C-alpha cells in the first residue's frame, strides 16, 4: 500500500526524549534524529526560497537593485547564517 | 489505456507501507535492546553456581550410605555386640 502522494510526516516532536540523557532511551532516538533532520531541511528550503526570491528580484531590479530589495537581502542572509551542515557557524537548534 | 497510467499504480502497489515499516523498526529496536540486556545478564552467571553441592544430584551419598551402614565391613564396633537383644 501507498498514499500515492506527499509523504506526510508527524510535525509533533517525539515524546520521551531528554537532552541530558539522550542515550538512555534508544527507541526514541531515531525519530528525534529524523525530526531534527527534517527541520534542518525545512530551514534549507526556506533559504532556497529566499534565494529564488532574490533571483527573481535581480532581473526586475535593474541598475538600482539596492534601493527596493535591501530588506529581502537581510532576510536571505539571516537564513544562510543558520544553514544545515555548512561552514564553522553551526546553528544551535 | 496508455503505459504511464498503469505503470504509476503498478509502482505504487510495488512500494510498501511506510507506517508498517516505521512501526516494525521501532518494535525491532525495542525487543532487540531488551534481548541484548537479557544476554548481558546471562553472560554474568559464574561457572560454579552458588548452591552447587546443595543440589540433590551433587550429594549422591547422604541417601545411599544410610542403607549401607548395616552391611558387614561398615558397622560401628558397638553395633553387633548389643544387637543380640
From TrEMBL, chain B:
One GO cellular component term: mitochondrion
Protein origin, superkingdom: Eukaryota
Family matches, as Pfam families: NDUFB11 (PF17250)
InterPro entries documented for this protein: NDUFB11
GO biological process: photorespiration
Signal peptide start and end residues: none
Protein name according to UniProt: At1g67350
Organism annotation: Arabidopsis thaliana
Species lineage: Eukaryota, Viridiplantae, Streptophyta, Embryophyta, Tracheophyta
